[PDB]
Ligand binder design. Structure first.
Ligand code: I3P
Length: 87
């Protein structure tokens, strides 16, 4: 909502670098992950067991509707966490 965005911003800067998402991107993606009912809180990102219903949906709306405005953010925020929960 304001802090979590920074907790993941500094994280993706070590697992992605300059390619990492911005503060304005994640912030927008979050609001969408809360409106779609896919998430109840911004801390839900700490649940690697919910990335399934959150990855298929985003990839479903993008492939269908024809827009991955939120996917580009999810994939990035995920590519980092996925590595943080592997070590
Ligand atoms: O310090 P970090 O961990 O590198 O995170 C950056 C920080 O939040 C900056 O204030 C922000 O500039 P804005 O508040 O103007 O968005 C930038 O977005 P940006 O890369 O699009 O400039 C973020 O990436």
């Amino acid at each position: 909502s304001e802090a979590v965005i920074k907790v993941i911003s500094s994280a993706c800067k070590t697992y992605c670098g300059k390619t990492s998402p911005s503060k304005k991107e994640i912030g927008a993606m979050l609001s969408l992950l809360q409106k779609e009912g896919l998430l109840m809180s911004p801390s839900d990102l700490y649940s690697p067991g919910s990335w399934d219903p959150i990855t298929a949906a985003l990839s479903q709306r993008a492939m269908i509707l024809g827009k991955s405005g939120e996917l580009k953010t999810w994939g990035l925020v995920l590519g980092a966490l996925k590595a943080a929960r592997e070590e």
